[model samples]
Target: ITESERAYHLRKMKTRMQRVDVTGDGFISREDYELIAVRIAKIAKLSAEKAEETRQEFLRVADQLGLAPGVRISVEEAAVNATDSLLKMKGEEKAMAVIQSLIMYDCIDTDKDGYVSLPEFKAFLQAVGPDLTDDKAITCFNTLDFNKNGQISRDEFLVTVNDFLFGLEETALANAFYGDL
Candidate 1:
């Protein structure tokens, strides 16, 4: 990383940390991230098993990236560990992968008007996992809506998927997808 890039990522890290470390505990722990899954269950009114799946996805990634057991992930640790996967890719490569994933989005956007409806979102989740209730879909819709427009734009979904899947770019927006970073 160049001096300028390093400096920018440093700033982004601080910003993302503030947004994600909602507990203000100064560390990003697995518990913090998993709580979102639980919150989704509560707010989305999903079954325990369904919510557990969401929590599991969060932990699966965190376990691969979070600090040791019972340990918290510091800003420096989080920043240093995950800001390179996509960064290393060619410009077109990154875009290509994002574009490719949109195929999945199409499957979710049943209306074909370009935005993802709550029904579509839940349908996609249900297709991939076990039974998904509207409650769970509603909860996810609110979050993916990003701008609170009540509809999930292609870009919004793209940004989120890119963030969770790669954690490569240092955008505050990308960081937002992973609550409590």
Candidate 2:
């Protein structure tokens, strides 16, 4: 890739980093990987045994992040991994497939009142097969609620989605969707 092209991609990688770091932690840990894997399995309605198998397979590639055989990888390294994955997906239009898999925000809002509560978010996570603890849920909620108003507005959600889709993550707000940033 050319220098300018690499620069553009690095700038865009922030979105992928935020999207993958579900826990909003700057570092992607083993648990986060498990959460996402289970979430996908659940969203796909995979069976319990199948879900477990899928998670195991997903973790097998964890080393690609360049982290040692343990837990946690910095956001910087995660961007590299996300880059590799995104590049591979783009080769087959899988990136478009990703955008296609997303459900509408209204569907996630169980209350139908518009704003999403922590419980509702938890419910969504649970439905996706990963049993999230209260602490982790609170962190994710706080990360999404940019104004700390206790509820995530559509504007905030959209901004987060936008950041996830396109961001260099230089600003704290952009990476705030996940991480100590």
Candidate 3:
């Protein structure tokens, strides 16, 4: 990777760490995920079931990261966990890196459509920032919509998600994962 690309990736990682650590405790805890869930549910006005699904999704990620009920993780550990398949022993071993992508897409694509639009993208951005404005959501959606088709396809979504989580350099449009990061 070029030095500039590496630098950009580092900045993106730091931004993600800062936002995900909502409690300002220098660590990401289960409570933080729960709190984020509550915020997203309230801010996005999600359905009761959808809100529950959102909460469970976050918990599932925490579980795979080896975050027990009371466990917390530093940013460094989270970075490593993102790149590594931390839960290879789980029943659905490849889900950590593979399945979760489609699951998340389904979560945000609440309408059951095959694509994720502006509203759907906005709702999902709640995972990064509950109070993200429509402009922020628009920016992210635009970046992710490589075809300029006004929506994000499964391929666009998967590529960005994979790069955002597993890539060593910021060569793709993954910079918009957390919206403007």
Candidate 4:
């Protein structure tokens, strides 16, 4: 590519990287990736079904790129990887992963507390068209919070967030772990 084209793509990638770096932590986590997908689907005017379909497809692409690992990926790394992947796909597939990453990261912060929580999860489910009642929300909360703690700590939160982002629907048992939360 020409220098101007290269610079333009780099600028685009940097913008995306900023979107995924929701926490301003300089690294993009799994949650960040998932939330970004959802947002991008919406921005592209995709229907709910299509949006989720796009999100799932993005997840698969991420897997193939070895970008779905548990550890956070830095903005620079994500940009390079995305640029490389974009070269291989024609159409929106290339941008889908990066956008999804940002959406997923954005969605998980339900309470705007700069973290994920049961309330945030509930809010997300409800916001995303899930028909979850308060009772069901509580059930989900208790199930995933583990250790019976009224709140979820960062470590506990990350484990569940990672699983949920990767499409694992099963909940962690409340009695299985112990923490102050």
Q: How far is 22's C-alpha from truth in model 4 (Å)?
A: 0.5
Tens digits of per-residue lDDT for model 3, 1-181: 4666555656666667767787778788877767666666776788999888878876776676567887888877675554344322344554456556576676566556789887778766865675677787788888999999999989988888666754656553765777666
- TM-score per model over all chains: 0.48, 0.41, 0.73, 0.34
Between the candidate structures 1 and 2, which one is better when assessed by TM-score? 1
Q: Which ten residues in a row have the lowest lDDT in candidate 3?
A: 82-91
Question: Of the candidates shown, which would achieve the greatest lDDT relative to the real structure?
Answer: 3
lDDT of 4 by residue, 49-87 (tens): 766765675465456546666767898988777656565
Candidate 2: Cα lDDT at 102: 35
What CA RMSD would you report for each candidate?
A: 9.0, 9.6, 4.6, 17.1
Which scores better on TM-score, 1 or 4?
Answer: 1
Residue clash pairs of candidate 2 = 15-164, 24-178, 24-179, 25-179, 26-179
Runs in model 1 deviating more than 4 A are 1-8, 66-68, 80-156, 159-181
Cα TM-score of candidate 1: 0.48
For residue 101, give model 3's deviation from the true position in Å: 3.9
Give candidate 1's whole-model lDDT.
Answer: 0.58
Give candidate 1's root-mean-square deviation (CA, Å): 9.0
Against the reference, the lDDT scores of all candidates come to 0.58, 0.57, 0.70, 0.51
- C-alpha displacement of 106 in model 2, angstroms? 1.1
